[PDB]
Amino acid sequence: NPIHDRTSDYHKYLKVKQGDSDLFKLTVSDKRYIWYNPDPKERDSYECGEIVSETSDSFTFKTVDQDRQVKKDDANQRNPIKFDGVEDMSELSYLNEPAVFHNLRVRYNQDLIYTYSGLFLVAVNPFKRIPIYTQEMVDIFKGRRRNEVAPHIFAISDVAYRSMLDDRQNQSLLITGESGAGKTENTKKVIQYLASVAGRVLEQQILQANPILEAFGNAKTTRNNNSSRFGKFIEIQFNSAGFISGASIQSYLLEKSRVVFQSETERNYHIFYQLLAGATAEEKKALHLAGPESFNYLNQSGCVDIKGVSDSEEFKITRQAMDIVGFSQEEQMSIFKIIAGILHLGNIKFEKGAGEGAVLKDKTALNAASTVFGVNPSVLEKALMEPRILAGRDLVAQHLNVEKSSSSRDALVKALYGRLFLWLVKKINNVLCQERKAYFIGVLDISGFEIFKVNSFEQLCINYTNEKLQQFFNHHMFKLEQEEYLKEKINWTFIDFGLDSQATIDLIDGRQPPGILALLDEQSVFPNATDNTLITKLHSHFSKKNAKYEEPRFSKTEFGVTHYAGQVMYEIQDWLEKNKDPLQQDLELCFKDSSDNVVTKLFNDPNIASRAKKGANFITVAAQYKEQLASLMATLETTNPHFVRCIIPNNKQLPAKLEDKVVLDQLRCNGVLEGIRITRKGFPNRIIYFVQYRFGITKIFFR
Numbered sequence: 001n002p003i004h005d006r007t008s009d010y011h012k013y014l015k016v017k018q019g020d021s022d023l024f025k026l027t028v029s030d031k032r033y034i035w036y037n038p039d040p041k042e043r044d045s046y047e048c049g050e051i052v053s054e055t056s057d058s059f060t061f062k063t064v065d066q067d068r069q070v071k072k073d074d075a076n077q078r079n080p081i082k083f084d085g086v087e088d089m090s091e092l093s094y095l096n097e098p099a100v101f102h103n104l105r106v107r108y109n110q111d112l113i114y115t116y117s118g119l120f121l122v123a124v125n126p127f128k129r130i131p132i133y134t135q136e137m138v139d140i141f142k143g144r145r146r147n148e149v150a151p152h153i154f155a156i157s158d159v160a161y162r163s164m165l166d167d168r169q170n171q172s173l174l175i176t177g178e179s180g181a182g183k184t185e186n187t188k189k190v191i192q193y194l195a196s197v198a199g200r201v202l203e204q205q206i207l208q209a210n211p212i213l214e215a216f217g218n219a220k221t222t223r224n225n226n227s228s229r230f231g232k233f234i235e236i237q238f239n240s241a242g243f244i245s246g247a248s249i250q251s252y253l254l255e256k257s258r259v260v261f262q263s264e265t266e267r268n269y270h271i272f273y274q275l276l277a278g279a280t281a282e283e284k285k286a287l288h289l290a291g292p293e294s295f296n297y298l299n300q301s302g303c304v305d306i307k308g309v310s311d312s313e314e315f316k317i318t319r320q321a322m323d324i325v326g327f328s329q330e331e332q333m334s335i336f337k338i339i340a341g342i343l344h345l346g347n348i349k350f351e352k353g354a355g356e357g358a359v360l361k362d363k364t365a366l367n368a369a370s371t372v373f374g375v376n377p378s379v380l381e382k383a384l385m386e387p388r389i390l391a392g393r394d395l396v397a398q399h400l401n402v403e404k405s406s407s408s409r410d411a412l413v414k415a416l417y418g419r420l421f422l423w424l425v426k427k428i429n430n431v432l433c434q435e436r437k438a439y440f441i442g443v444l445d446i447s448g449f450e451i452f453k454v455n456s457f458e459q460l461c462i463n464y465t466n467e468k469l470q471q472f473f474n475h476h477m478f479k480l481e482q483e484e485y486l487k488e489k490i491n492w493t494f495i496d497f498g499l500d501s502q503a504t505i506d507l508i509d510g511r512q513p514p515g516i517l518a519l520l521d522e523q524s525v526f527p528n529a530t531d532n533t534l535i536t537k538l539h540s541h542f543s544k545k546n547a548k549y550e551e552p553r554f555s556k557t558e559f560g561v562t563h564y565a566g567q568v569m570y571e572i573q574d575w576l577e578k579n580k581d582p583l584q585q586d587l588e589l590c591f592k593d594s595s596d597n598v599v600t601k602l603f604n605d606p607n608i609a610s611r612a613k614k615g616a617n618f619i620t621v622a623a624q625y626k627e628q629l630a631s632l633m634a635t636l637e638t639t640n641p642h643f644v645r646c647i648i649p650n651n652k653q654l655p656a657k658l659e660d661k662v663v664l665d666q667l668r669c670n671g672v673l674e675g676i677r678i679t680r681k682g683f684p685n686r687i688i689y690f691v692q693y694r695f696g697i698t699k700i701f702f703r
C-alpha cells in the first residue's frame, strides 16, 4: 500500500510532508493569531498577528512591524496551525477569506494543487509539471472513496464513475475557471482516468481526438499560451456493465475571427504554425508555403513562436493523432491544402481601380489559393470583387471597394476554417460512435472568463457562458438545496448566500424586457442599422436603468457589463456584421465546384454548409449561440453534476507565484466560502422513510 508508505511517490507528491520538532513546538503553543490587513486600502494583503488580549467584544493583537484592536465580530481568526495543509477545508474551525487562502497557500507551496472545499474540488494551476498523473497514480485511485485518498481530479472522476454505476444515473463534471486556470488540462485527466479504469483502439482514438481539436481550436492569447477558442462537452459513454463503449464531442461556436485578426503578442490557431514548421520541403513546395512572416494572417501580432513549444514537434503529434483516428492520407493532404489556401487568401491585396471598385493587379496569392483549393481563379476573383445579388428580383453584379472586397475575402476564410473545424469534429465523432450508450459521464470544458484591452462580441458570449455556469453552481449548491429543505419542512431558516447572477443574465439575454442579445438581433434585421445606432439603442434601454450596465463617459463605442467575475467594457465595432455573419453566395458557388473532396463537402453537405432560417433571414450568431447554450443547459439537467473550480495563481503564467488579490477575487466570485458554509450548516443526505438529524415530510435528512 503506497497510501500508507511514507516513501511512496503518492506521499511524496500528494501528501503534506511530515512536520519536524520545531513545527511540533509551534503546533502545541497556547498562543492565538488573527489575519489582519497591514494596509486597510489593500483588503487582500494579510499578515499574521498574535492576539495579546481580549475584552467581551474585541481582540488586541501585535502587528508585524505596533498593537491594534478589532471587534471580535470583524475578526478573521487564524486557524490552529494543525489545520495548515488540511485536505478538506470544511474541517477548518475558522471559515474566512484569509484562512481559506492560507490553507490553499500551504498546500500550493508544496505542489499540492488539489484541495476539497467541502463537496467540490479546488485545483490551483501549478504552471509546471507535477508527476501525479502516471498510470501508477491512476491505479492507486481506482475504486477508492473520496475520504480514503488525497484530493485529486482522479478521485472526483472515480466518485462520478461509481455514482454512475450505483445510481444508474448519467453524471457530469463541470470544470470552471477564468482563461488559463487549468480547465482543459483537468478535462484531459478526467478522460485519461475514465478510459483507464473503464477501458478494454477505441480508448486510444478517444485520447487522440484531443491534439486534433487543440491544433485547430486552441491559440496563444495574452491569458493562455494554449487557450481553447471553442468550448466542448465530452460525453464518455459506457455500457450496462460500466465499460467504455464510445464517446461524443459536442463542440460549441469557434472564435473564427482569430483566423484573419490577432491582437499584439497573440497567435493564430496552432495548426498554421505547425504546418509551416513541420512540413516536408516539398510538402512546402506543393502548397506554395514559406515562413509565417510571409503571411498577413500570421505576421501582424509580432508573435510567431510560443516559449517552450516546438510547432514542428507538435505537427508530428497532430499527424499521428490524425492517423490513429483514421483520417486517410488524402484527407490529411486536403486538410493542409485548406490551411495553406487560407494563408494564401490572406495574402491577396485588393487596390482601387479606375473607379470606386477594387482590382487585383497582383494575382500570385489568388492563383496559389485557387491551385491548392482546386477552384477556378477567375471565378474566385469575380466572386470576391464583383459578387452578384438580387435587387428585388433582378440579378445585379456588385463591384466592391478595397475594404468590402477584403472583408468578403475574410468572410470566405472564416467560413472555410469554421466549416473545416466542424468537419473534423464530425469525422472524429463518427469514429467514436461504435455503440448505443447505456450511460455517460459528460465533461464540460468551455472557453473561460476573459478580459482583454479590447472585448468584442465573442468575449460577451464567452463571458456570459461563464456567468451561466457559475449560476448553475449557485442553483445546485444553494438554491435547490434550500428549496428541498423547505419543500420538506425540516426547521431550516433560509440563508441568503448573496450569489445571484440573475440580473446580469437578464441584462444579456432577457426576453421581456429585451436584453442585449435580443436588441442586437433586432438591429441585425433593421435595414439601416449601424454599430452606432446599435450602441445608442443599448444605451437608451439600459443606461441608468440597469444596475449591471454602464454607459461609459470616456467612450462612445463601449458599454460595461458587471459580470460575477468583474466589470467588462465591450467595444461595439463590427457587432452587426459579426452577428449577421454574411458570406456572398457567389463565393459558395465558386467553392461548390472545387475538385477537392474535402472542400466540396464543406460547401455541399448541408449539415456543415447549410444555415438555418428564422423566417425571412438566416439564424444570427447570437441565436445560434443561444440554441447551443440552451441545449447544453438541458443536457446538464439530465445529469448529476460534480464541480471542479480551477484557480489561476497569477496573471503571468508562472509557477511558484501565488498572488493574493488574483486568487482571492476568484474564491469570492466562485462562491467557494459560501459553498463550504452550506456544506457545514446543511444536510447533504436524504432518503424517503429507508428500511445531526432532521425529520422532513417524506424524508430523513442528515449532516
Ligand SMILES: Nc1ncnc2c1ncn2[C@@H]1O[C@H](COP(=O)(O)OP(=O)(O)O)[C@@H](O)[C@H]1O
Pocket: 125, 126, 127, 128, 129, 130, 177, 178, 179, 180, 181, 182, 183, 184, 185, 186, 224, 225, 226, 227, 228, 448, 646
Ligand atoms: N494540472 C496541471 N499541470 C501542469 N500544468 C498545468 C496544469 N493545469 C494547467 N497547466 C498549465 O496551464 C496552461 C493553461 O491551462 P489550460 O488547462 O489550457 O487552461 P484553460 O482553463 O484556459 O483551459 C497549460 O497549457 C499548462 O501550461
Ligand SMILES: O=C1c2ccccc2N=C2N(c3ccccc3)CC[C@@]12O
Pocket: 229, 230, 231, 232, 251, 252, 253, 254, 255, 256, 445, 446, 447, 457, 458, 461, 462, 465, 621, 625, 628, 629, 632
Ligand atoms: O464556450 C463556448 C460556448 C459554449 C456554449 C454555447 C456557446 C459557446 N460559444 C462559444 N464561443 C463563441 C465564439 C464566437 C461567437 C460566439 C461564441 C467561443 C467559446 C464557445 O464555443
Ligand code: VO4
Pocket: 177, 178, 179, 180, 181, 183, 184, 223, 224, 226, 227, 228, 229, 446, 447, 448, 449
Ligand atoms: O484560456 V481557456 O479559453 O481554454 O479558458
Ligand SMILES: [Mg+2]
Pocket: 183, 184, 185, 226, 227, 228, 445, 446, 447
Ligand atoms: Mg481550455
Ligand SMILES: [Mg+2]
Pocket: 453
Ligand atoms: Mg478602451
